[PDB]
Design a protein around this nucleic acid. Sequence first.
RNA 1: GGUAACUGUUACAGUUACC
RNA 2: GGUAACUGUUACAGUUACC
Lengths: 72, 72
Amino acid sequence: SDSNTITSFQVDCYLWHIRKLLSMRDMCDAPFDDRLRADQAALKGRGSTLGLDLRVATMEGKKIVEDILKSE
Amino acid sequence: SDSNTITSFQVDCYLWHIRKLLSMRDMCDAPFDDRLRADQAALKGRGSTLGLDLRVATMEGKKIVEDILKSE
RNA sequence: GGUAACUGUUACAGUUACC
RNA sequence: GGUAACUGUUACAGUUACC
């Protein structure tokens, strides 16, 4: 495995989750929803490529984002 | 102006800031950096289109994202 | 050679915001 | 009519990870 590849995937998963919360609350525009849809399919492909569960990678991405923000 | 368009831009700006932090810590892979570069140009275009300052929009996206995560 | 995601460019169709 | 960003499809060239 490549460490930064996994880290990038986990963070992309968590940032997708944040974006989805915005859409769910009716706070986003249509192109934003278009990107959500396309990125969801892309993250499924990357997760299969890396052999990583998406739910678990999202939780790991949350920890990574919180740590780099705590260090900012 | 359209409220969800502005909100979408503010949030995209703040998430770009988070991604940039990961890259400045050399924790990302090359495609992640390619996306960062492309999205920085795109956000400059959207900010010009909306007449919005990117630094301010980034701070406003931070508040929106924190408010959403707080109510999750 | 293959799988996956992406970047630059190209052609067509479209969505949104604004003028 | 235009500006901006994007989505789907297409063509070419690359980047990365893994096999």
